[PDB]
Design a protein around this motif. Structure first.
Motif, PDB file in Angstrom:
ATOM      1  N   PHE A  41       3.799   8.053 -45.697  1.00 20.44           N
ATOM      2  CA  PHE A  41       2.547   7.771 -44.970  1.00 20.44           C
ATOM      3  C   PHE A  41       1.333   8.120 -45.808  1.00 20.44           C
ATOM      4  CE2 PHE A  41      -0.052   7.311 -41.218  1.00 20.44           C
ATOM      5  CZ  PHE A  41      -1.092   8.131 -41.450  1.00 20.44           C
ATOM      6  N   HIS A  72      -2.384  12.439 -35.313  1.00 22.42           N
ATOM      7  CA  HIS A  72      -2.369  10.984 -35.597  1.00 22.42           C
ATOM      8  C   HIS A  72      -1.806  10.233 -34.392  1.00 22.42           C
ATOM      9  CE1 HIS A  72      -1.357   7.245 -37.647  1.00 22.42           C
ATOM     10  NE2 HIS A  72      -2.436   7.541 -38.280  1.00 22.42           N
ATOM     11  N   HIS A  99      -9.298   8.062 -41.819  1.00 22.18           N
ATOM     12  CA  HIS A  99      -8.123   8.333 -42.636  1.00 22.18           C
ATOM     13  C   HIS A  99      -8.527   9.032 -43.923  1.00 22.18           C
ATOM     14  CE1 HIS A  99      -5.865   5.962 -39.707  1.00 22.18           C
ATOM     15  NE2 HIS A  99      -4.846   6.623 -40.120  1.00 22.18           N
ATOM     16  N   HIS A 141      -8.260   4.053 -35.649  1.00 25.44           N
ATOM     17  CA  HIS A 141      -7.611   2.746 -35.901  1.00 25.44           C
ATOM     18  C   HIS A 141      -8.422   1.660 -35.237  1.00 25.44           C
ATOM     19  CE1 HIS A 141      -4.662   5.948 -35.716  1.00 25.44           C
ATOM     20  NE2 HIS A 141      -4.202   5.372 -36.825  1.00 25.44           N
TER      21      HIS A 141
HETATM   22 ZN   LIG Z   1      -3.531   6.215 -38.563  1.00 28.13          ZN
END
Ligand SMILES: [Zn+2]
Ligand SMILES: [Zn+2]
Lengths: 72, 273
Positions: free
Chosen positions: B211, B37, B62, B53
């Motif tokens: 997360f 990540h 994701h 992203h």
């Molecule tokens: Zn991320």
């Protein structure tokens, strides 16, 4: 483009060094990036854009609470 | 695999979930996800290659990342499914999510150190190894300085946006993806990272187990948006430089496309949608 700076902020030396532009906290590089709207984030404050690299360095100093950066 | 609202989990489900997280941490597998990540956080730019992203593939990337994570958890304990955190409802530090029998609470004032729950550094079970600074302990500042999580009305305003994404396919875009991600507008996903604080607000945010629950709720919101707008497809649909089009593969797996990930039900269902 981004303006150089070199100052002490809350007991940390923060720099914006022009060659290539880099931001440093106590001589360690802070990875930063600029969004296309001109705003700046860093790896210490990734999700909260501010206006300038100096603002990004200051936000990182608050977050670090005295801690040194490590390499990326 | 049935992903449940975290607020509905039993004591037993929480115990198994946190035991599985602690075992995945000890094996080294947990930190591999943090490393991957962080690589995309550093790599993805508005002007350059962008995959995880600030791009249309934020959502399927994701989704696939969470499927991978949940399969790693299930190899530890096959009864476990990732729960989701509806921060529009469970919106204070007093939520059951942050009890000691689940994720533990906020960080103490001195150093942001989490002092309770399974992930507190004093347990010796959650060394922070993938880091951007010297601190080896989980930190949080839940709602620090009066930060507010998004409301239900703010979430609904983004769910109402029928267009999936728009050129220039980055932080400047209008449309659902960028408003959900939060680089424009009322700000859903980014603001929640900031609200938790500590590592969750940084480029090594998967160090906080929350997360996964935040991203499971963002993933659920994508499913809810699809139900509201069934004819709204993923875009773009071909030939966009530096952007993952509908039928292109995504790094790092290189064997899955956004098209393969639009329907979550091949992989899991929700308790309710
Ligand atoms: Zn991320
Ligand atoms: Zn995120």
């Amino acid at each position: 483009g981004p303006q150089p700076f070199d100052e002490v902020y809350q007991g940390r030396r923060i720099e914006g060094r022009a060659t290539g532009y880099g931001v440093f906290i106590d001589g360690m590089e802070l990875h930063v990036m600029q969004n296309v709207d001109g705003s700046w984030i860093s790896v210490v404050s990734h999700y909260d854009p501010v206006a300038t690299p100096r603002a990004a360095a200051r936000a990182a100093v608050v977050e670090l609470q005295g801690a040194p950066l490590v390499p990326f | 695999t049935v992903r449940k609202n975290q607020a509905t989990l039993t004591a037993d489900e929480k115990r198994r979930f946190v035991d599985a997280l602690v075992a995945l941490k000890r094996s080294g597998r947990y930190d591999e996800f943090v490393t991957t990540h962080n690589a995309f956080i550093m790599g993805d730019t508005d002007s350059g290659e962008r995959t995880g992203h600030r791009s249309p593939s934020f959502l399927p990337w994701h989704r696939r990342f969470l499927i991978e994570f949940e399969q790693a958890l299930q190899a530890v304990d096959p009864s476990v499914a990732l729960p989701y955190w509806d921060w529009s409802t469970d919106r204070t530090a007093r939520a059951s999510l942050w009890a000691p029998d689940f994720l533990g609470g906020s960080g103490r004032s001195l150093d942001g150190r989490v002092m309770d729950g399974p992930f507190a550094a004093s347990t010796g079970n959650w060394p922070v190894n993938v880091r951007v600074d010297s601190r080896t302990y989980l930190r949080r500042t839940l709602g620090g300085g009066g930060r507010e999580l998004p409301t239900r009305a703010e979430v609904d305003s983004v769910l109402a946006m029928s267009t999936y994404d728009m050129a220039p396919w980055n932080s400047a875009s209008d449309g659902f993806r960028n408003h959900l991600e939060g680089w424009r507008g009322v700000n859903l996903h980014n603001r929640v990272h900031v609200w938790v604080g500590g590592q969750m607000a940084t480029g090594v945010s998967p160090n906080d187990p929350v997360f996964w629950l935040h991203h499971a709720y963002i993933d659920r919101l994508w499913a809810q948006w699809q139900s509201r707008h069934p004819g709204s497809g993923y875009v773009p649909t071909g030939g966009t430089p530096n952007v993952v089009d509908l039928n292109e593969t995504m790094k790092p797996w290189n064997d899955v496309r956004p098209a393969d990930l639009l329907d979550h039900t091949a992989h899991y269902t929700f308790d309710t949608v």
